[PDB]
Design a protein around this ligand. Structure first.
Ligand code: CL
Ligand code: CL
Ligand code: CL
Ligand code: NA
Ligand code: NA
Length: 129
């Protein structure tokens, strides 16, 4: 599914991401825009052979099992294909674990390089939430 901006903000809000670990909703919308262009079916291979999955590009090296990332972990205890669903629950629940692992949203390279230090509230401006 390709979400609209405000549609995704509302879904993320209902799933408890607004100010989760101190990250306002616009941070999560901004990260999703630049990780996946709001497309739940996004996939992208990494140089080390791992793959990133879904709206928040969660990587199989640590967080999910895809059966083809040797020596990896599965810390969210999910198949990576679950992260491609039109229902974002699994992506959101795994992201809560990632953002709590000590580095906050810096775990998402695109957030650090494209969202951190910008006016992220613009990403939710106009939305009925
Ligand atoms: Cl914030
Ligand atoms: Cl959903
Ligand atoms: Cl933090
Ligand atoms: Na915000
Ligand atoms: Na894995």
């Amino acid at each position: 599914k390709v979400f609209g901006r405000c549609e995704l903000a509302a879904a993320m809000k209902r799933h408890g991401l607004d100010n989760y670990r101190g990250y306002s909703l616009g941070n999560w919308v901004c990260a999703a825009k630049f990780e996946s262009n709001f497309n739940t079916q996004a996939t992208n291979r990494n140089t080390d052979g791992s793959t990133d999955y879904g709206i928040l590009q969660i990587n199989s090296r640590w967080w999910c099992n895809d059966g083809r990332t040797p020596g990896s972990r599965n810390l969210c205890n999910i198949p990576c294909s679950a992260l491609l669903s039109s229902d974002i629950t699994a992506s959101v629940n795994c992201a809560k674990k990632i953002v709590s692992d000590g580095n906050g949203m810096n775990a998402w390279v695109a957030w650090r390089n494209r969202c951190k230090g910008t006016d992220v509230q613009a990403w939710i401006r106009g939305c009925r939430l």
